[PDB]
């Protein structure tokens, strides 16, 4: 049985009907030609093609794509057409998903943190941060006093990182609550296999196994390992490691959805601290599969 920080875990099965989730958040939907699905699909970044081929291979699953951006009416027809052409593809708009169970007011986050900084002795506090918090509190946009709405507005990478974590918390229920055809088979508490669009599936994945039900991509560049969020598998909705990360996003004012919402969440979940060895933890939590060619943007360029 796998173990870390003095505790043993089960390799939990992620069964072969678990849906697969991709993501495409488009800051520049005007860049596509008329009649094109607005998911990047160049020779350099053949991402829509990769997603279609995944759905073709995994014919017994639903392949979802969580999308966001100011799509035109014609682009929304192209998404419908895409779904009509590929039976097991679900296009899921961010704005249509019910994330409200994960939200928190920004004003509460700031106020709690102000009180936290005031509880420290004056010589031991972050005086600069305490001043920023008081000014942030005064400048919350009207009607936008919401952690989730504050990320929905962004157009840089934290926009897709933040909703990626929440969509994986929803997991099976992301799919069941769309009402789309074919999603009848998934349960609200089912797990989810999240992949970047450059994660190439070459054959059926079958049953997956993950310590305590979660595993994530590990990048290894120049003998240096890094936990990454470009593949994430969970065996159930509201996985406790992602709940721990959401709690941090709700508490830590300079939190980042990748470093904190995913990374610190999974570290806390397994009691990883500065006492422990990062490479050993990477080895422990790693998701890798012989039928996936990982992160093929490494051969071209990053799309963000």
């Amino acid at each position: 049985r796998p173990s870390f920080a003095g505790k043993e875990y089960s390799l939990e099965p992620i069964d072969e009907r678990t849906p697969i989730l991709f993501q495409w958040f488009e800051a520049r939907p005007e860049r596509y030609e008329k009649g094109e699905v607005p998911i990047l699909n160049t020779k350099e970044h053949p991402y829509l093609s990769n997603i279609i081929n995944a759905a073709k291979i995994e014919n017994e699953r639903i392949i979802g794509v969580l999308v966001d951006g100011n799509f035109t009416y014609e682009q929304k027809k192209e998404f419908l057409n895409l779904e009509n052409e590929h039976q097991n593809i679900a296009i899921i708009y961010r704005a249509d998903v019910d994330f409200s169970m994960y939200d928190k007011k920004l004003s509460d986050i700031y106020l709690e943190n102000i009180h936290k900084q005031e509880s420290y002795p004056a010589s031991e506090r972050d005086n600069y941060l305490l001043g920023l918090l008081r000014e942030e509190l005064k400048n919350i946009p009207e009607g936008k006093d919401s952690l989730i709405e504050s990320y929905a507005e962004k157009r840089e990478h934290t926009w897709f990182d933040f909703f990626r974590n929440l969509a994986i918390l929803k997991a099976g229920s992301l799919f069941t609550e769309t009402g789309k055809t074919g999603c009848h088979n998934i349960s609200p508490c089912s797990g989810c296999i999240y992949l970047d669009a450059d994660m190439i599936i070459t054959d059926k994945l079958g049953v997956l196994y993950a310590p305590d039900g979660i595993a994530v991509h590990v990048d290894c560049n120049d003998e240096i390992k890094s936990l990454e969020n470009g593949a994430i598998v969970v065996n159930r909705s509201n996985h406790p490691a992602l709940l721990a990360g959401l709690d941090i996003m709700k508490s830590k004012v300079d939190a980042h959805p990748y470093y904190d919402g995913l990374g610190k969440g999974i570290k806390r979940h397994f009691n990883y601290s500065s006492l422990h060895n990062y490479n050993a933890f990477c080895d422990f939590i790693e998701f890798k599969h012989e039928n996936i060619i990982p992160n093929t943007s490494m051969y071209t360029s990053s799309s963000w």
């Binding site: 972050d126 600069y128 920023l132 840089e156 890094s226 300079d254 470093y259 904190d260």
Partner: protein, 87 residues
């Protein structure tokens, strides 16, 4: 030169520093170390992240690269000041 760019960033970037760190590809475990070492000093966390990027990218650690990253993660006003102080 880079030092003046770092000064402009530290003077202007607060709550969102990790977005810039991620755009600069500062690793997850190095962010852990920064936070451990400067738990009550946000500005020093920004500066340490910039220093780590510089040490990691070596000669590719240029003002141009820094400005491109600022623009890419939508800190365009900070990038403006950086380019202002440079010229």
């Amino acid at each position: 030169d880079l030092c003046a760019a770092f000064n402009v960033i530290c003077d202007n970037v607060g709550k969102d520093w990790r977005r810039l760190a991620r755009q600069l590809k500062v690793s997850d475990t190095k962010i852990d170390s920064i936070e451990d070492r400067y738990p009550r000093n946000l500005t020093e966390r920004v500066r340490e992240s910039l220093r780590i990027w510089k040490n990691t990218e070596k000669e590719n650690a240029t003002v141009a690269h820094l400005v491109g990253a600022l623009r890419s993660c939508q800190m365009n006003l900070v990038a403006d000041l950086v380019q202002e102080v440079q010229q």
